[model samples]
Target: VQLVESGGGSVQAGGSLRLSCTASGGSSYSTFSLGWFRQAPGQEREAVAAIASMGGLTYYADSVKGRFTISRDNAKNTVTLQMNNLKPEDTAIYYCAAVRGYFMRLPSSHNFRYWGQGTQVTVSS
Candidate 1:
């Protein structure tokens, strides 16, 4: 998987960050689900959401969804994630991961077999 930064440039605090991830060397028919995770400036990683491939469906954890949107351009073989209302707390290294199934089917049901190169969006000038 490859993660590419999108949008004009660096995302300033209180602004939005747009990014995309593309999966390769896999069956197109394979479930194209994705998840967004974050590693704070100096903290452990946390799950943000699980994105659906069919119609941009997303399951966000608590209040995360209100500030994020997940989209995809199958023709381009890429998935896009947009986070708005960014705060200093949001300043972290974000990643997009491709999984096999839904989150409810944990352990073996759906695991992040591949990940995109991370993109770090600092909430500062």
Candidate 2:
């Protein structure tokens, strides 16, 4: 897996940014999707959204729609999660999850059964 962070030499509130994760060496014929989650400093975890391999399909939980978008670029074998209208509350560690099968049956459900090293985003102005 690989991760890329975009938007910012300096990060601050109301700014734009994106972080992406890509998977390699996986079975293409197998159904695979990507997920994003948030882990705030000393706080509980939160679900962001899920994107299918095709990128056009999405299933974002209610709380995530306005500020988050999940997309994939097949050429790069990458999945990206973008967050806009940044706020301090959005500051945290973000993770990418690879899922196969139904959302409820996500092999890594509940906990980070699978995770990236994590991307750290801090909001300040």
**Candidate achieving the largest TM-score:** 1
| Candidate 2: Cα lDDT at 26 | 45
Residue 81's lDDT within candidate 2 is 79
| Candidate 1, residue 37: lDDT | 73
Q: What is the C-alpha lDDT of each candidate?
A: 0.65, 0.66
- Tens-place lDDT per residue, model 1, 9-51, is 3567778777666667645613677776767766777777666
Alpha-carbon RMSD of each model: 3.5, 3.6
lDDT of 2 by residue, 1-125 (tens): 34344433337888878887766564461356777877888887677777654334676656657887878776776778777877787788877777553444222335334467667888887
lDDT of 2 at 124: 83
Clashing pairs in 2: none
